[PDB]
Amino acid sequence: KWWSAVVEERDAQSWTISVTTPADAVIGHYSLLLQVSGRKQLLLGQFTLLFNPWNREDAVFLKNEAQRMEYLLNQNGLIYLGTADCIQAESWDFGQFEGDVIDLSLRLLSKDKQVEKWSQPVHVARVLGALLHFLKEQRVLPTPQTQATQEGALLNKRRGSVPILRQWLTGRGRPVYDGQAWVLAAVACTVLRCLGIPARVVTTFASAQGTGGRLLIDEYYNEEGLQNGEGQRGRIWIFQTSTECWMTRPALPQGYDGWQILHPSAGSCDLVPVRAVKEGTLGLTPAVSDLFAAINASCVVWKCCEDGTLELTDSNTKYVGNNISTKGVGSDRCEDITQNYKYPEGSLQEKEVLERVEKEKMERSPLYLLLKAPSSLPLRGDAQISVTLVNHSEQEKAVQLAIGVQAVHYNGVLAAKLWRKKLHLTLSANLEKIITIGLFFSNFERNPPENTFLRLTAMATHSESNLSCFAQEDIAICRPHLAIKMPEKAEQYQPLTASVSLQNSLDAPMEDCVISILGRGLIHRERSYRFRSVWPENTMCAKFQFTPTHVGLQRLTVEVDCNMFQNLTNYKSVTVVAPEL
C-alpha cells in the first residue's frame, strides 16, 4: 500500500527494481534519489505520476472498459451546435496527448501554493475551473463592429483546443472573438483528460443562463414584432456548453458518486453532482439552486407600447432545457443523456419536486393563434410558413397581424433587423382561418452574419381589446451538403484515394473556391487546393491521394471556403490495420 520497491531479477552487472506506488499521492514532476550509507545522494532521473481510472482502490475509478477507452484515450471528438430542432455536429480535436500539454497544465496548476491538497481530484478540478474561467474573461476580445467579409474566412475557423490553450497562456497566436466563446468547456475537458480525470462535453439547448434564484424570465417586444432595446439580465440562450467529470464524493453524504457538472461562478468554482440536480436538493451546495433554475424555468412576455406602459400578452408556452445531448461511446453518433437531468414532464414525481422547491422558495381569450414553421431553411432559398387563427365569439372581429424576422447571435444578442410585415384581417362566425405565406431570402433587407440564427415572431393584436396573442420560433440556417467517398478499410503504407463531391445548390456562382484537408495521424499538417468557378447548375468533383501511417482508427476532415460562405466542415472515419506478415 505504501511506497515500496522489490529487487526481482538479479544479474552480475544489473538489477531490475520494481517501484510501486500508493493509491493517494500528489501528482506532478517527481525526482528519484538513491542514498547509500556512504556516498552523497544521487539523482537517478525524473518522471510524472498521474491518476488511473483502472485501479479499483483509487477514487476516480471507472468500472467499464469501453467507457474508459472513449472518455480517456480518445482524441477525436464532436461538439453539437445548432437549434434543438436540427442538430449539426462539428468535428473537434482535443489533442490531449500532445507533447506540451502536461507541462503547461502543471505550470498553470502550480500557482496555488496549497501543495498537500493536490492529492485529491476535487481540489484540482475546482481550481482549474476557476483559473480557466478567469483566463477566458481575460484574453477574449469582443467582435469588430465594422464588417470585414474578406477576413471572415480567418476570424471564425477553429483548428482544435491546443492552439487556443497556447494563445491564452502566452498570447502569441490568433485571438478568439466573442462569436465563439463556447470553446471554454472543451478546453477544460482537454485539461482534465491530460491530468487523468475522465470528462466529456455536453450541450444544453435553450438554457436559462443569466440571473438565477428566480423561476421567471421577462422579455420585451416591440409594437412591430421586434425587441426594443438590447439585452436583459436573464435571457434564453440558443445553446450553452458545459463540462461533466466523473469522480466520487467522499466529503458529501453517501450516495452521490458519478457524474458531476463543473460550474464556475462570477472567482470561485465548484462542482455539483447531477443527482442533486435531479432530486432538487438546494441546500447541499450553494450552486445547486442556480443550476436547477437554469434547466426548468418558465418565461413571460411583455408588450411595450408608444405610451411606455408595458402589457402582458397571452402566448404559447415554450420549453426550457430540452434535448440534452452528447457524444456516444464507441461510435460516431449522438446520444441523449437527458433522462439524467429531468423527470418526464407531467409525472407525479416532477410535480412533487416542483411543489417542494416552490414551497422552499416561498420562505425566501376569445381568439388565439398558432404557428407552423420549418425546422431548417436553405441558404439563398425560401420556405413557407403558416399561421392559424381561431376565434371564440359570436360577433365578428377585426385583427392586426404582424410578422417579424431577425437574426440573433448564440447568446441572445440581437444582430440585425431583417423583415417585418403587417396586415389586417376580419374573422367571422367563429371559424378558424389559416394564412400561408412564403419567406424568400431575396426579399430580405440585409445579409446575415457568419454565425446567427433567425427568430421568427408573430403578434396578433385584437382591434377591440388590447390583450394580444404572440408566438415565436427559432430556425437554423442549413448549408449545402458535402459528400465524402472513401473506402472503409485501408492497408498501412499504401496509397489511399479519397473523393470529394459538392453540388452548387445556391443561385450564385462560387468563386475563389479553396478547400483544405487535414487529419491527425493521416496527413502531416494541412493541405490546400484551388478550383475554378462553380456555376449554380453544375457541381464539382475532386480526388486526393495520401497514405496512412499509424495503425488503428483515424478520421479525416475536409473544409471548404468560397465567397458565399466559409468554414464548411465535414469528416469521415476509417480503420487501418497492420500489414500481413
Place this chain on the structure above:
Amino acid sequence: QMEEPAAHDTEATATDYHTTSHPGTHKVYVELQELVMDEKNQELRWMEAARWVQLEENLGENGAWGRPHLSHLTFWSLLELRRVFTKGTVLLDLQETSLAGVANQLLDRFIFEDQIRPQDREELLRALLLKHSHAGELEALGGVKPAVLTRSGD
C-alpha cells in the same frame, strides 16, 4: 476525367502549430550515406562514407577509417547548397517512428510543391527502402561501385 486541382500556399494557419516546449541543447553525430552497388550482384545499396564526431573521418576503399582532419569544402558545393535550400522542402515536428512513414510523408510533400512528377513516386519509394549495410559487411561484399537509378530499376 476527374480534374485534379493545383497547389496553393497560405500561411494564415501556420501559427497554430508553433510549439512552446523548450527542446534544449544536445550534441550531434553526423553520418553520410550514398547510393552504390556491389560487384558480385548488380544490387544498389546505401553506403556510409564519413563521420563527423569531432573532425571529418572518411572511409577508404579497403574499409578502414583514416585520420581525423579539418573540414574544407568547394565553392560549387556551397553555391548549389544555397540554391537548392532556397527552394527546398522542410518538414518540422514530424510524428513518426519508422523510416517508411517518413519516406511516405516526404514524398507526398514533394508531390505537393511540384518538385517531382507523380509517376516517379513509385521509383523513389522503392529506392528509399533498401537495406542499409554497415562497416562490418564490406569485406563480405567484395567491394561496391556507384550505381545511379533507372526508370526500369535496372
Place this chain on the structure above:
Amino acid sequence: LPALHIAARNDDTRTAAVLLQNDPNPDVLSKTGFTPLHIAAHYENLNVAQLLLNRGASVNFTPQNGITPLHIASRRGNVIMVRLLLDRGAQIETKTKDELTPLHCAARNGHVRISEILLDHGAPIQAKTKNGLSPIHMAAQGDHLDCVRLLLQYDAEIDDITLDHLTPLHVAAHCGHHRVAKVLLDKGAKPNSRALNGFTPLHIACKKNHVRVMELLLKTGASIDAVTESGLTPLHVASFMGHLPIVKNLLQRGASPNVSNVKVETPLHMAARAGHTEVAKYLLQNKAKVNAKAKDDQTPLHCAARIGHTNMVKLLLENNANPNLATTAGHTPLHIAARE
C-alpha cells in the same frame, strides 16, 4: 470455491492458477447456482476469463434460471466481453426463464454498440418474449433514443403489436417520452392505430398527463374526434382524470363539450363523478349545456349529490339547473341528497 469467485472478483490470477493446477473442476455452482464465469462476466475481469475459457468453461452452461454469462455481459454492457465470448463460440438465440434473448437485455439497458455487434452476428431482430414484446418495444420503454434509430436503420417492423395490441407509440405515450415519439412519427407510424381497448395514443396521453406528446400527435394529425370501444372521448378521459392543462389545450385547439357516449354523458357528467372543480368551471365557461339528461336521465346534480361536495353545487346553480328536474324513476336531487 466460495473463494474461487472471490478470486474472480479481484482478478487474482496466480491463486486461481494454482486452484486449477491442483483441482480439475472448472465450474462449480454457488448456493444461487451461478458459475465462476458468470461472476467473471459481471466485474469484467478478463484475464481470469481467458483462464477459464482455456479449459471447460461452457459458454452455454445454463442453470435452472437459464441465464447465460452472455446475458449478464450484455446486461452490464461490457463490450470486450461480448467480443471474447462470441469469438470463443456462443449460441445467441437462447431463452431465459422469461425467454429473454440477449438482444432483449441489451435493448433494455441502452447499450447501443452491443446491439450493433449482435445484430451483425445474426441475432433475429423480430422476436417475441413471453408476452410478445419486440426489442424495439422494450428499448422504447427505457427512453433510449439512438437505440431506436439503430434498430430502425438495420431492420425493424414499426407497427408491431403484442398480446395486448400495443404499437410503440402506445408504450411511448404510456411512459411519457416525446423524444422517441418524434422519431417514430417522422420515420413511420399511424396515429389511427388502436389497442385492444380501442384506445388511440391520444387517449393514453390524456390519461397519463403528458403534454408534449399530445402536441406532437396533434401536429401530426391524430383526429380530435375519436370513439373508444367503451364510448368515451379524449375530452372525457381528461375530465375523468383531473388534468387541467390537457383540457385547456384540447379545448383551445378545437373540441366539443357537447358529445354523447354510449350512455349519454357530457364531460360535466363525466367530471361530477369525481368533482374536479376547475375543469368544471373551464368546461362550463365554454358552450356546454348544463341542463342535460343522462341514460336514466340523471341531472349532473344527481351525479353530484352522491359525492357530498358542497361548492361544486353552487357553480352548477350558477347556470341554474332546476331542482324541479327529476329522473325517470321520479327521484329528485333532494331525494338522492337524503338517500346519501
